[PDB]
Each structure stands twice: as structure tokens, then as C-alpha cells.
Ligand binder design. Structure first.
Ligand code: HEM
Ligand SMILES: C[C@]12CC[C@H](O)C[C@@H]1/C(=N/O)C[C@@H]1[C@@H]2CC[C@]2(C)C(c3cccnc3)=CC[C@@H]12
Length: 466
């Protein structure tokens, strides 16, 4: 009897299980590197730290491109900005200027610590009014980090109850949900095969965001002083007047860069905060010691500063541990080969798509002890007196040309938020018995199912007010 003709073949089922984990499972059969061909596009997947650092660092310039996608084109205004732009003059320029702006907050008046703590304070006040109740903390946190990133881009911040915050929240959730059904890595291109209204919806959410950026520019346009350079829109409008690289600083090119920064700044930070609280509800023992640590090394004489990350070591290890278990980007932003190159001495043609399975690096059992468990202790020496780096297979913020540019902002944000809340609130399981599911929801960002927290002001915090 003959075998039957085979038109196509995929190694696992679509839309079954998370993509980053189905790839990681295949490595038992095929090794840490393998490829898939979808028509003419060929995709290479990589799930070992040595091969990944070759792609990201050693040959980082050979694989610094970005593939083209229908949804990303719409959300990137046709591959402008940074995250979704291909490697070239536009991406080079805007990435540098964005990195350059972050320098404007090292210390002084707008010391990033000051801006951040200004909004955490307002955050804690609004939360303290819910003393005794179970709430979803997504939106209060959303507002806090929305204002930090707004002060950094525009030197403006939204007053309490500004409906424009709810409008931003709305299209942020619309874009994220239509950008990709699950992760950005989809074997089958479904939206080109079946009749669907996906791109129509994405265009309409994008339209509301873009029309909002145009209005924000036009007012700032008639307020820009070439001597005042206090934010990112200044840094970007400055470089424009100098070009008269004028072609790559058009109004849209600036629009899209601010967009990638405003977006990333809110959605990544908010997501990691929710993940952290969720893990601590499942891990009361760790939470208790976090209270102990912050009470011993900060007490209640003052509110926590960046300085405290030298003595609040367990809180640092908890943040590092969430970024390992539930990376914001378990497969990063897909890369592309700008030229013919190789990985582990394997041929890789120009234009090939390359994906680093960061989920695989963070769960490699030869590199981590019990990687499925949430053990912040793994980042502490056995005595708990100094942070460590237990595995080289650890890259929450990526590496190389395409690495995160908001890491400094991110780490300071996550630390100050968690330190202020733990100093001040008992964060307990709601009165109903429900805990948050840690399974997660893979989108362009690795989100968690929304959940509620019973929040109480700490008795230790009430005392010391006398
Ligand atoms: C815990 C928080 C965060 C994590 C874990 C994280 C991680 C990452 C990763 C893994 C990448 C790309 C890796 C790759 O493509 O090779 C990336 C890129 C990027 N991140 Fe984040 N990030 C975080 C927060 C932020 C924040 C707060 C900002 C604020 C501006 C930001 C802005 C960006 C941008 C613009 C890119 C694109 C880089 C490029 O394409 O060259 N990220 N981040
Ligand atoms: C999609 C978006 C969040 C929703 C906004 O309405 C549009 C944002 C964007 N405009 O198209 C830029 C995206 C951001 C989502 C997060 C992104 C993809 C991001 C990132 C993602 C994961 C880790 N670090 C950074 C870079 C661009 C950021």
C-alpha cells in the first residue's frame, strides 16, 4: 500500500497551547534550532542561550531587521517609529534620539525618581480610599504610569478624572487585541485566508490614537522653544529644525516614535505589576518576608527611594523572578536577517525570519533549578545578602541592537511601585476565594487575566502617624 500525497505538514496544532511553549517542546525532537516554511517565507526558531546571543549580540547587526506584517504596518504607520521599523536610517535615528531623551532625567529637577514617586504617591492616595474593599488595580496603575510617560514625552500630566485617560485605555485594549489573536508568531496566516473584519477594527482604533497625537502636536508646535529641551518631543522637534536628515523627521515619523514610547511605557509596566501581585497572592510566604524586609530597611520614617534597592534585595529578586517566569515578550519582537549569515554554523538566507524563544531560555532545566516554580530565592546568595546571576540564559530585556530602550525606566518603575505598595497596604486574597490564574494570555505583550485584590491600609502604617 502506498503513502498518500502530502500537500502540507505542521509539527503541532494551531491555536492549541501557547506558541512559545509548543516551540519549546519541539526541541526534544529537533534540538534548539529549527525552521518552518510558510509559502516562500522561511522562519527559524531559536531556543538556546548561546545561539540566541549569536543572533542578538555577536551577529547582532546581521539579524537586526524586522519582518513586515499587515497588522504591524497599520499600528506602526507603515513601519515607522522604532519597535516595528526595519533596520535603516529611520530606526537608527529615532532609537538614538529616544535613548538620548532618557538622559535628560538622570538627576536634578526632573530626576526620573522624582517624576515616578510623584505619581506613585497619588496612586497610593486613591487606593487608600478603597480600604477594606476588593478592587482591580489595573486602571489606577495604568493612570500612574500613563502620567510618568506623559511627563517624559510632553511635560504634561492628566488631572484626576480626565476622560482622555479612559479613551486611551479603550484603544490600547482594542489595538492589543486585534494586533494578533495570540502571539505575533502565527504559523498559518489566517487573516488572509478567511473573510474577517480584523484589519478594519485595527485601523479604526489606530485612527483614534493617531488623531489624538496630531491634536497634541499642533498645540505643542506653537509652544516649542529651541532652548527648552526637557522631554522627548522637544528632543525630536529640535533635531528636525537642524535638518534645514530632514526626510526621516516628518510629522508622521515623530508621531509614530512618540506612539511606540507612550504605548510601551504603559502596557509593559502595568502588565508586570499585575503579574507580580498575582504571584504574591499565590505565595504569601514571600509576601511576608517582603513586609519584613521593607520594614527593617526603610521603616515608616520616609517613603522608599531608588537608593533602597541596595537593601531591599528580596524585592529585587522578586522582580527578576517575574521577568523570568512571565517575560513581557516570551518570544521578543521577531527579528529578520538583513544579509546572508549563519547561526550555529547553519545557513540562514537574507530575509529569513528569526525568533528567539526567550521562554525556552528562561525555562531550560539544565540552566535553572525547578524552572516552573516561582522562587525569587534563586537570585539571592544562600544567606540572602546580595543579588546574584544564577544563569546566563536570562535576557528579559533582550540584547544587542534591538534591545529594550525603556529598561532603566522599567526597573525603576517596577521597584518604586512595589516598594510603596508593600510599605503601606495589606494586599490579600479577595473575600471570595478566588486567586488569579497564572496561565497568562499571550498577546503582543504577555498579559494576565484581570483579577481583584483586597486592599487594606497597614496597621503598622496607621501607627507611626501619631
Ligand atoms: C518589564 C518591562 C519591559 C520588558 C521586559 C521589556 C522587554 C523588551 C524586549 C524583550 C524587547 C525587544 C527584544 C528584541 O526585539 O530583540 C523590547 C523592545 C522595546 N522596548 Fe521594552 N521592555 C519593557 C519595558 C519597556 C518600557 C517601559 C519602554 C518605554 C519606552 C519600552 C520600550 C521599548 C521599545 C521602543 C522597544 C523596541 C526596541 C527596538 O525595536 O529597537 N519597553 N523590550
Ligand atoms: C501596541 C502598543 C500598545 C497599544 C497602543 O495602543 C499601541 C502601542 C504601539 N503602537 O503600535 C507600540 C507598542 C505597544 C505594545 C508594546 C510594544 C509592542 C513594545 C514592547 C513590547 C514588549 C516589550 N517591550 C516593548 C514596543 C512597541 C509597543
Amino acid at each position: 500500500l502506498l503513502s498518500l500525497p502530502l500537500v502540507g505538514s505542521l509539527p503541532f496544532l494551531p491555536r492549541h497551547g501557547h506558541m512559545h511553549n509548543n516551540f519549546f517542546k519541539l526541541q526534544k525532537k529537533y534540538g534548539p534550532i529549527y525552521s518552518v516554511r510558510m509559502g516562500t517565507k522561511t522562519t527559524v526558531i531559536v531556543g538556546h542561550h548561546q545561539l540566541a546571543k549569536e543572533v542578538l549580540i555577536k551577529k547582532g547587526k546581521d539579524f537586526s531587521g524586522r519582518p513586515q506584517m499587515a497588522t504591524l504596518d497599520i499600528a506602526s504607520n507603515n513601519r515607522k517609529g522604532i519597535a516595528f521599523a526595519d533596520s535603516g536610517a529611520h530606526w537608527q535615528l529615532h532609537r538614538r534620539l529616544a535613548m538620548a531623551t532618557f538622559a535628560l532625567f538622570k538627576d536634578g529637577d526632573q530626576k526620573l525618581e522624582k517624576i515616578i514617586c510623584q505619581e506613585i504617591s497619588t496612586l497610593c492616595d486613591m487606593l487608600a480610599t478603597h480600604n477594606g474593599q476588593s478592587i482591580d488595580i489595573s486602571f489606577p496603575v495604568f493612570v500612574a504610569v500613563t502620567n510618568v510617560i506623559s511627563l517624559i514625552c510632553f511635560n504634561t500630566s492628566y488631572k484626576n478624572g480626565d476622560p482622555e485617560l479612559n479613551v486611551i485605555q479603550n484603544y490600547n485594549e482594542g489595538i492589543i487585541d486585534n494586533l494578533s489573536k495570540d502571539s505575533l508568531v502565527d504559523l498559518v496566516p489566517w487573516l488572509k485566508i478567511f473573510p474577517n473584519k480584523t484589519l478594519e477594527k485595527l485601523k479604526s482604533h489606530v485612527k483614534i490614537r493617531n488623531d489624538l497625537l496630531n491634536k497634541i502636536l499642533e498645540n505643542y508646535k506653537e509652544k516649542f522653544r529651541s532652548d527648552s529641551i526637557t522631554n522627548m518631543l522637544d528632543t525630536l522637534m529640535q533635531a528636525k529644525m537642524n535638518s534645514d536628515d530632514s526626510e526621516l523627521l516628518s510629522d508622521n515619523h515623530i508621531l509614530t516614535t512618540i506612539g511606540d514610547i507612550f504605548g510601551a511605557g504603559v502596557e509593559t509596566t502595568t502588565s508586570v505589576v499585575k503579574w507580580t501581585l498575582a504571584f504574591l497572592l499565590h505565595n504569601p510566604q514571600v509576601k511576608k518576608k517582603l513586609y519584613e524586609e521593607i520594614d527593617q530597611n526603610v521603616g515608616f520614617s520616609r517613603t522608599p527611594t531608588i537608593s533602597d534597592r541596595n537593601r531591599l534585595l528580596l524585592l529585587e529578586a522578586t522582580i527578576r523572578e517575574v521577568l523570568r517566569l512571565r517575560p513581557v515578550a516570551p518570544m521578543l519582537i521577531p527579528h529578520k536577517a538583513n544579509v546572508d549569515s549563519s547561526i550555529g554554523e547553519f545557513a540562514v538566507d537574507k530575509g529569513t525570519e528569526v525568533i528567539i524563544n526567550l521562554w525556552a531560555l528562561h525555562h531550560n532545566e539544565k540552566e535553572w533549578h525547578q524552572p516552573d516554580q516561582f522562587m525569587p530565592e534563586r537570585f539571592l546568595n544562600p544567606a540572602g545578602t546580595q543579588l546574584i546571576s544564577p544563569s546566563v540564559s536570562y535576557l528579559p530585556f533582550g540584547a544587542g541592537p534591538r534591545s529594550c530602550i525603556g529598561e532603566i525606566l522599567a526597573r525603576q518603575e517596577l521597584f518604586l511601585i512595589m516598594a510603596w505598595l508593600l510599605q503601606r497596604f495589606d494586599l490579600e486574597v479577595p473575600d471570595d476565594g478566588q486567586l488569579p490564574s497564572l496561565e497568562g494570555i499571550p498577546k503582543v505583550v504577555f498579559l494576565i487575566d484581570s483579577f481583584k485584590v483586597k486592599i487594606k491600609v497597614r496597621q503598622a502604617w496607621r501607627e507611626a502617624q501619631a
